């Protein structure tokens, strides 16, 4: 199957999660294209993949990264029925609205018809060894849901 991952990372933590999730997935007989939101992918490309993984940190007042906002709006015009999807992000518990960018992206994927096959994965700030193992398990479980 063909997979796409779109992530956002300002201080590298969500990037580290993306690289380890995609690196695990890459060891299967599936292709995965990993794209940084700062390269401005158009949301219509999501329609062209069998599975979709989004990664995002949370920004001010429980919001999406600023660089995700145009893409998020463009998701209202895409059809994801049938696709398998999942979301992860780095987070900070000094904020009350903890990791809610993950929950916002999950909700939009649901609205467009994707089958969200994993709970959202939230890691506090920089992954530690246990967090990297969670990233491994996330990629492993995602692949199990494909066909
Ligand atoms: C201005 C600012 C606002 C933030 N707001 C939240 C928030 O509401 N909730 C949250 O969980 N983290 C929030 N954070 C924390 C970032 O999500 C956190 O530092 C994360 O590790 C960044 O991921 P990154 O390294 O991929 O950029 C915010 C951080 C900054 C600097
Ligand atoms: O792409 C726009 C339209 O796509 C689908 O039909 C959605 O279910 C509908 O709510 C939306 O208005």
Ligand 1 site residues (CB inside 6 A) read 9-15, 57-60, 62, 90-92, 95, 97-99, 125
Closest CA to 17 of 97, 91, 117, 114: 91
HSE at residue 100, side-chain half, CA atoms within 13 A, is 9
How was it solved? X-ray
Stated in angstroms to one decimal place, the resolution of this structure is: 1.4
CA of residue 49 to ligand 2 center, whole Å: 19
The backbone torsions φ and ψ at residue 142, rounded to the nearest 5 degrees and listed phi first, read -60, -45
Closest C-alpha to ligand 1, atom 1: 60
Other beta carbons within 10 angstroms of residue 81's beta carbon come to: 9
Residues 6+ away with beta carbon under 8 Å from 3: 25, 30, 31, 32, 33, 49, 50, 51, 52, 53, 146
Beta-carbon contacts of 121 under 8 Å, excluding residues fewer than 6 positions away, are: 17, 86, 87, 88, 89, 102, 134, 135, 138
CA angle 5, 22, 81 (to 5 degrees): 40
Q: Does domain 1-147 have CATH number 3.40.50.1110?
A: no
**112, two tokens:** 């467009």
Q: Give, using CA atoms, the residue closest to atom 15 of ligand 1.
A: 92
């Amino acid at each position: 199957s063909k997979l796409v991952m779109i992530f956002a990372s300002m201080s590298g933590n969500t990037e580290e999660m993306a690289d380890h999730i995609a690196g695990v997935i890459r060891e299967t007989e599936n292709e995965i294209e990993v794209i940084d939101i700062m390269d401005s992918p158009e949301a219509s490309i999501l329609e062209q993949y069998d599975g979709i993984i989004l990664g995002a940190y949370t920004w001010g007042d429980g919001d999406l990264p600023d660089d995700f906002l145009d893409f998020y709006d463009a998701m209202d015009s895409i059809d994801l029925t049938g696709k398998k999807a999942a979301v992860f992000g780095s987070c900070d518990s000094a904020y009350p609205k903890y990791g809610v960018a993950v929950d916002i992206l999950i909700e939009k994927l649901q609205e467009r018809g994707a089958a969200v096959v994993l709970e959202g994965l939230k890691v506090e700030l920089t992954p530690e060894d246990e967090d990297v193992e969670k990233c491994l398990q996330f990629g492993a479980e995602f692949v199990k849901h494909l066909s």
